[PDB]
Ligand SMILES: NC(=O)c1ccc[n+]([C@@H]2O[C@H](COP(=O)([O-])OP(=O)(O)OC[C@H]3O[C@@H](n4cnc5c(N)ncnc54)[C@H](O)[C@@H]3O)[C@@H](O)[C@H]2O)c1
Ligand SMILES: NC(=O)c1ccc[n+]([C@@H]2O[C@H](COP(=O)([O-])OP(=O)(O)OC[C@H]3O[C@@H](n4cnc5c(N)ncnc54)[C@H](O)[C@@H]3O)[C@@H](O)[C@H]2O)c1
Ligand SMILES: CCCCCCCNC=O
Ligand SMILES: CCCCCCCNC=O
Ligand SMILES: [Zn+2]
Ligand SMILES: [Zn+2]
Ligand SMILES: [Zn+2]
C-alpha cells in the first residue's frame with residue numbers, strides 16, 4: 001500500500017542549468033488536503049521544459065520538470081472531490097481554480113493560482129513535496145511530471161475518459177491543446193481566411209491543425225527545418241516556406257504571397273525575430289497575430305506603435321485559451337470519438353530512463369513529440 | 375458662377391514646420407471625374423493637424439491641413455452620383471472606396487486608397503488641386519479642409535442629413551467618431567466592464583462617451599490637466615486621476631484600483647510613455663488595450679512579449695473602426711435623433727481667419743474642440 005505514505009521512486013532531476021537530467025531516487029510526500037498524487041504513465045517532451053535547461057526560462061532549481069502528461073490517480077488528500085484513486089487524469093500547467101476573476105471571466109484562462117509569472121516552484125500552498133539525497137526539490141508549473149509519481153493541486157488535475165490511451169492523450173495536456181486552441185479560441189480563425197504559422201514543432205503543427213479545422217483557405221507553414229514540411233502538408237498546410245531560401249525578410253515574402261498579408265499569423269517558436277516577422281506579416285488593416293512561443297527571459301521587442309494603429313490586433317495566450325480543467329477532458333472526448341488524431345505528432349517513443357536521448361532528438365530537429373513511457 | 379472654373383479663395387497654408395499658418399489667396403482647380411468641390415462651413419481643430427505643425431507627423435509641405443469638417447457641395451466632377459451641388463457633406467480622412475480588400479472585409483476600415491501610411495499629399499489620382507503664389511500646394515489626408523473651398527475624392531465625401539447643424543456635426547468627421555468608435559467597435563467594451571481612458575481631449579472624451587454607451591461599470595479618466603476632469607465626469611467618467619499626484623507609476627495605481635487591471639484601456643494622447651502605461655494597466659489575463667493616439671514619428675516601444683502571452687490583446691485603429699462613408703452619416707442621423715450631444719466637446723468658436731488663435735488654445739490646454747466658422 002502507498003496511500004498515506006512517503007513514496008520512494010525515480011525521477012529526472014535538473015540540478016543545474018545547461019546540464020543533462022539525472023535519473024535519481026527521490027521521495028514524494030503524501031498529498032495534503034486538496035492535492036492528488038498521480039502515478040505517471042506517459043509524458044511528452046515539450047520545448048518549454050527545454051527552455052529551463054537552456055536558461056531561457058527562469059524557475060527555481062534544483063527541479064523536476066515535465067508538464068505534458070497523463071497518469072492514474074494513486075491517492076487523494078482530504079477534501080478532494082473531482083478525482084479518485086484509479087481515475088485516468090491529465091495534470092494541467094495552468095490550473096482552473098474556478099473562483100478567481102480570471103476563471104469567472106468566460107474569455108480568459110490564466111488562473112491566478114498559476115506558477116507561471118514569477119515561479120516559486122512549489123504547489124499552491126507554497127511548499128514542495130519532493131526530496132532527493134537530503135535536498136528539497138522544486139516543482140515546475142505545479143505539475144513536475146518527469147517523475148514516476150507526482151503530487152498536483154486538485155484544480156490542476158483533469159479527470160479523463162477511463163478508456164483513454166495515455167501514451168497518446170498526454171499531448172492534449174499541453175502541446176496539442178495549446179496549438180489547436182491558439183487558432184480556434186485565441187485568433188478565432190475564420191472560414192476562407194489566410195494564415196501563416198511560424199514553427200512546426202508539436203505546438204505549431206497543432207496550430208496548423210486548428211487553422212484547418214477553422215476552415216482557413218490558406219495555411220502557410222514557415223520553418224528553417226524543411227524536414228517538417230511533409231508533416232505540415234499532411235496536417236493541412238497549403239504551402240511550406242523556409243526563410244533560408246530567400247534574399248528578402250520573410251515578412252515581405254509572406255505579404256507578397258498574400259495580397260498584403262495574412263489574416264492570421266502565429267509565432268510558435270519563442271524568438272524575438274520570428275515574433276516580429278509574424279506581426280509584420282499579417283495585413284496592416286485586418287490582420288491578427290498571436291504569440292504562442294515563449295521568448296527568452298526578460299528580452300524585449302522594439303515596436304513602432306504605427307504597426308497597430310492601422311488596424312492590427314496583437315495578442316498572446318497560454319494553453320490555446322482553453323480553460324484547463326473543463327477543456328482538456330472535452331478534447332480527450334473528441335479524440336476518443338476520432339474527431340482528430342495525434343499519431344502524426346508522436347514521432348518517437350522511449351522509456352523514461354532515456355529522457356536525455358529524448359531531449360537530444362528535440363535538439364536535432366528529428367522529432368516532433370517524443371513520448372516517454374514509465 | 376464657379377462650376378467648371380478655378381476658384382480663388384482664402385486658405386490656411388503651412389509653408390514650414392513649427393511656424394504659424396499663413397492665411398492667403400489660393401486657387402482651387404475644378405473637380406476631375408469622381409471628385410467633389412466643397413464650400414467649407416465649419417472645421418474642428420484636431421491634434422492630428424497640430425502634429426504636422428510640430429513635426430511629429432510627416433506629410434509633404436507646403437500643405438493645407440484640416441480634416442474634421444462639414445460643408446456644402448459646390449460642384450461635382452463627371453461620374454459623381456453619391457452627392458450633388460447643395461448637399462451637406464462631411465469629408466473623410468480615410469476613404470471608403472468599397473472595392474479593395476479592406477473595404478470588402480467587414481472587420482476593417484483602413485481603405486487602401488488612404489494617404490496616411492506614407493503620404494503623397496495628393497488626391498487619389500496622385501495630383502494636387504491647389505496652387506498658391508505660382509506654386510502647387512499639397513493636400514492632407516485627402517481632405518485639406520483649412521480652406522474656404524477644397525476638392526476631395528468622392529469616396530472620401532459622405533452625404534449627411536440636410537438639416538444638420540454643420541458647426542456641430544463637423545466633429546463626427548473625426549474626433550467624435552474616432553473616440554466613440556474606439557470604445558464601441560474596436561475594443562468592443564462590454565456591459566459591466568472596467569475601463570481606463572488616457573487623454574481627455576475631444577477624442578478621449580468621445581472614448582469616455584463610448585465606454586458609457588457600451589455600459590461600462592467603471593470609467594477611469596486619466597489626464598495631467600485636472601481642468602478636463604469636470605467634462606470627463608459629465609460625459610461618464612466614474613473616477614478621474616492625475617498621474618502627477620502619484621509617487622507610484624500610473625499603471626500600478628490603476629491595477630490596484632481595479633483588482634489587477636482594467637478590462638479595457640485606451641491611449642488617446644500619442645505618447646510612448648502613456649501607450650506603455652495603458653497596455654500595462656489592463657489585466658494581464660483578460661485585458662484589451664487600444665492605441666488611438668498618434669505617436670511621434672519613428673519612435674518605438676520596448677515590449678516584453680510575456681505582457682501578451684498571459685492573455686492580453688493589444689490593438690490599434692483609425693476612425694474608431696468605422697467604415698467612413700457608410701458610418702459617418704449614421705452617426706449624424708443618431709445625432710439628429712438626439713441620441714448624443716456634442717455641445718460639451720465644443721468649448722470655443724472662432725472665425726476661420728483666427729485659426730492661429732485656435733491652435734494657441736489647443737496648445738494652452740484651455741480648449742477641447744475649437745470650431746472655426748467660414
Ligand atoms: N503559450 C503556451 O501556452 C505554450 C505552450 C506550449 C509551448 N509553448 C512554447 O511554444 C514554442 C514551441 O514549442 P514546441 O514544443 O512546438 O517547440 P519545437 O522546438 O518542437 O518546435 C519549434 C519549431 O520552430 C522551428 N524554428 C526554430 N527556430 C526557427 C527560426 N529561427 N525560424 C523558423 N523556424 C524556427 C524549429 O525548426 C521547430 O520546427 C516554444 O517556445 C514553447 O516554449 C507555449
Ligand atoms: N486613431 C485615429 O484615427 C485618430 C483620430 C483622431 C485623432 N487621433 C490622435 O488622438 C490623439 C488625441 O487627439 P485630441 O485631438 O483629442 O488631442 P488633445 O491634445 O486635445 O488631447 C490630449 C489630452 O491628453 C492629455 N495629456 C497630454 N500629455 C499627457 C500625459 N503625458 N499624460 C496624461 N495626459 C496627457 C492632454 O492634457 C489632453 O487633455 C492625438 O495623438 C491625435 O493625433 C487619432
Ligand atoms: C511558465 C512561463 C511561461 C510559459 C507559458 C507556457 C509554457 N507552458 C507549457 O509549455
Ligand atoms: C495612421 C497614421 C496617420 C494618422 C492617423 C489618423 C489620424 N487622423 C485624423 O486625425
Ligand atoms: Zn508545454
Ligand atoms: Zn482561477
Ligand atoms: Zn477601399
Ligand SMILES: [Zn+2]
Pocket residue numbers: 420421422423441442548549
Ligand atoms: Zn482628427
